[PDB]
From a paper:
Proteins that contain the DUF2874 domain constitute a new Pfam family PF11396. Members of this family have predominantly been identified in microbes found in the human gut and oral cavity. Sequence analysis and structural comparisons reveal that [name] and other DUF2874 proteins are related to β-lactamase inhibitor protein, PepSY and SmpA_OmlA proteins and hence are likely to function as inhibitory proteins. Analysis of our structure and of the available sequences shows that collectively this family forms part of a larger superfamily of bacterial periplasmic proteins that all adopt a fold similar to β-lactamase inhibitor protein (BLIP-like fold) and appear to share some broad spectrum of inhibitory function.
[name] is a 145-residue protein with a calculated pI of 5.36 and is annotated as a [name] based on the predicted N-­terminal signal peptide. The structure of [name] was determined by MAD phasing to 1.85 Å resolution. The crystallized protein contained residues 20–145 of the full-length protein and an N-terminal glycine (that remained after the cleavage of the expression and purification tag). The final model contained one monomer, one cacodylate anion (from the crystallization condition) and 133 water molecules in the asymmetric unit. Thus, residues 28–85 and 92–145 can be superimposed with an r.m.s.d. of 1.7 Å and a sequence identity of 22% over 54 aligned Cα atoms. Although these aromatic residues are not conserved in [name], other aromatic residues (Trp57, Phe58, Tyr122, Trp130 and Phe138) are present in the corresponding shorter loops in [name], which may be functionally important. For [name], the negatively charged concave surface is most likely to reflect binding to a positively charged partner. The [name] structure is the first structural representative of a novel protein family, which has now been added to the Pfam database as DUF2874.
Author numbering: 0, 20 to 145
The structure:
């Protein structure tokens, strides 16, 4: 829970999380990394020196890609979401995407926030 976090090195992240960083953020420098706990659920957080932040679940699968200082790399985003954003907000870039096992939440440069379920039905749209 609150304040139970521990600092970690990159080589202590699950393999999948290390590969994700090398694939999508190869030139970023890690500023800090930690492991968090919530009951028996572990999560990992990485912040780069430019301020961009990643969170991963216990298996190193991303739950947050917060690129508010740049943009979310397009290869990270599910096609259905890319397509929806491209049609409906053609000039916006994505600053942040988060997900759990039930939904995705997307935040765009133009202030719009969109929630999709796992089948990509738009649940809520807010500004
Ligand atoms: C609090 As920050 C450096 O992840 O915007």
């Amino acid at each position: 829970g609150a304040d139970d976090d521990k600092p970690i090195q990159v080589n202590q992240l699950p393999q999948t999380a290390q590969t994700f960083i090398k694939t999508h953020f190869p030139d970023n420098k890690v500023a800090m990394a930690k492991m968090e706990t919530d009951w028996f659920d572990k999560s990992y957080d990485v912040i780069f020196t430019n301020g961009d932040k990643l969170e991963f679940d216990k298996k190193g699968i991303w739950t947050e890609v917060n690129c508010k200082y740049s943009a979310v790399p397009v290869a990270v985003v599910p096609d259905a979401i890319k397509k929806y954003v491209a049609t409906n907000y053609p000039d916006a870039k994505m600053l942040k995407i988060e997900r759990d096992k039930h939904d995705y939440e997307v935040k765009l440069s133009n202030g719009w926030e969109i929630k999709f379920d796992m089948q990509f039905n738009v649940i809520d749209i807010d500004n």
